[PDB]
Amino acid sequence: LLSPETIEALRKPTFDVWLWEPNEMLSCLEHMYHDLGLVRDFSINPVTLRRWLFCVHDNYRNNPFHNFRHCFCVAQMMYSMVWLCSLQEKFSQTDILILMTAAICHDLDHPGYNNTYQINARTELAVRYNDISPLENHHCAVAFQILAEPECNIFSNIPPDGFKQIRQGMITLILATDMARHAEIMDSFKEKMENFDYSNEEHMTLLKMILIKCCDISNEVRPMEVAEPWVDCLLEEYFMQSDREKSEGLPVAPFMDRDKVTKATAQIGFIKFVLIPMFETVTKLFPMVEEIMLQPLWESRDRYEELKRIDDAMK
Amino acid sequence: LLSPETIEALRKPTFDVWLWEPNEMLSCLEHMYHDLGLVRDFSINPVTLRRWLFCVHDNYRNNPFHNFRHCFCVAQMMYSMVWLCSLQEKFSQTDILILMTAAICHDLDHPGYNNTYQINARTELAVRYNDISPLENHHCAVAFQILAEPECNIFSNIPPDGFKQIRQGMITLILATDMARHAEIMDSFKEKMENFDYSNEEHMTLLKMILIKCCDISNEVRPMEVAEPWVDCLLEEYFMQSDREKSEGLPVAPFMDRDKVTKATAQIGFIKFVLIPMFETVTKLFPMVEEIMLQPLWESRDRYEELKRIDDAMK
Ligand SMILES: CCC[C@H]1CN(CC(=O)N2CCc3ccccc32)Cc2c1[nH]c(=O)c(C#N)c2-c1ccc(C)cc1
Ligand SMILES: [Mg+2]
Ligand code: NA
Ligand code: NA
Secondary structure, X not given: OOOHHHHHHOOOOOOOHHHOXXXXXXXXXXXXXXXXXXXXXXXXXXXXXXXXXXXXXXHOOOOOOOOHHHHHHHHHHHHHHHHHOOHHHHOXXXXXXXXXXXXXXXXXXXXXXXXXXXXXXXXXXXXXOOOOOHHHHHHHHHHHHHHHOHHHOOOOOOOHHHHHHHHHHHHHHHHOOOOOOHHHHHHHHHHHHOXXXXXXXXXXXXXXXXXXXXXXXXXXXXXHHHHHHHHHHHHHHHHHHHHHHHHHOOOOOHHHOOOOOOHHHHHHHHHHHHHHHHHHHHHHHOOHHHHHHHHHHHHHHHHHHHHHHHHHHHO | OOOXXXXXXXXOOOOOOOOOOHHHHHHHHHHHHHHOXXXXXXXXXXXXXXXXXXXXXXXXXXXXXXXXXXXXHHHHHHHHHHHHHOXXXXXXXXXXHHHHHHHHHOOOOOOOOOHHHHHHOOOHHHHHHOOOOHHHHHHHHHHHHHOOOOOXXXXXXXXXXXXXXXXXXXXXXXXXXXXXXXXXXXXXXXXXXXXXXXXXXXXXXXXXXXXXXXXXXOOOOOOOOOOOOHHHHHHHHHHHHHHHHHHOOOOOOOOOOHHHOOHHHHHHHHHHHHHHHHHHHHHOOOOHHHHHHHHHHHHHHHHHHHHXXXXXXHO
């Protein structure tokens, strides 16, 4: 249970996610729902909220990166963004609920190997989802198989009008965390940014997809003490893919090959080309993000480049 | 064995489809992949082609409408419009192969209850496909499961690069048979119709989708000896659903309700507001479409609107 200091600390992207076990992180997730007013406002059963989170945890696998601790991070970032940008002013509790609950469920039952792998290798998955985000489809399908189980049904006191709405909302947001759609989504978002209209449901739907996207890859925003380990974790998972592809005679992405990559090169690429554009467009709507999220993205890039000439002198 | 009155009758849309038993209709679909070049071309095995088709028979269901026979009508109709329109000049044999093969697999394993039931009943299927064309994804999914079996893999001898173009093609096509996407498809089709261009893959891709749709719903193009028994069938399914749907508290469509439908009324709008204006914008690119198809339609509309006043006098 929760230290009033921690209680404060948890809302900030600083927060050291490595000082926490699973079952403590679960106690943190429980807190966020209570704190955000979700439990009161959607008559969530407090036992059933605990049981669901266990049910959820249970169904993430032990991958180097795509494990429960990713999910917790993404959630905790969404919670963080909710306080930073005062999102409870700009969204309904039913939107807020959707964001949190998506965030938690978004990379569920991840097998460790992305869609590219799923597709190329004709996996039962990609067969079953016809090469359209077989992962991210599955994530949802699990997410609701879980919620179907009455003891893990935290929506049990929401009537069908509510549920239908949340279901669509979650399914959108989870499916947007395929990166194949990153520029697609980022373009459409910039288009609507010219004259952003908090009245306009398509604008908010985009905004929401962005927010979870920001979270689905916020790692580097955190302190580097905290952030860097994830990179190793990610790479470890990546090389674990390519080795199996190189084995089975399947395509290998340049970002996933042992020989071609370095930690320093790949992250410079990702920070400058993917992250800072996304967190820039979002800074337009919420200025308070420059300071808290762009700053330690700028720093993290400045570090990786000094680490680049150190990767270049050695080899 | 096929008599050459049959081998003549198959290439045109009149072809009566209630005569032939299953094993005989398989022979027709064999004839078509030899006759259209695809056996000679794609190095297709002559026994993997009779296994894949006997297999594909086993994985339709005994549905009042959406059955193997529906699969035959649509492909046999799809055959009819290769000669009719002379599509072997405009389209590649890849495009010819996809279109044929899609037609054959397009409503695979249909349970006889539409997207709107699966979803509203929160059925395993709907949960899995997240309300996104639940059936048209399931059909496509069952398809490529047969063609992953090595004793049915007709594409065995095809490259993955060819297979990958046959994949992300047959896919695009079967997901277009969700009439729920009808409106959306039509309008994007007339968007290109302004200035049509057989060079462009997209315009050509859109064309391909249109063509296959016209087939799923191509019953009243046929002679009303042949064409009218598919409105006793369609409704036998439609009612079976709306019996259970009322019986499980679930919304019922007007158009499926027992006591709001009389065959005639149903097909008049289904002809006036769906079939006619589709085939009309098919005919701008291929004029011979007018003669053969838009005719037996216009007359089936007349036939039904009189059949209407026999119904209206009675009630
Ligand atoms: C080895 C390079 C590390 C670098 C670049 N890399 C980018 C990448 O692999 N891909 C492959 C598909 C794609 C589409 C558009 C842009 C990039 C990429 C992955 C990544 C990086 N840094 C990160 O902090 C995170 C995080 N979170 C990710 C990351 C984030 C999400 C997921 C699903 C996977 C990886
Ligand atoms: Mg994911
Ligand atoms: Na687990
Ligand atoms: Na069967």
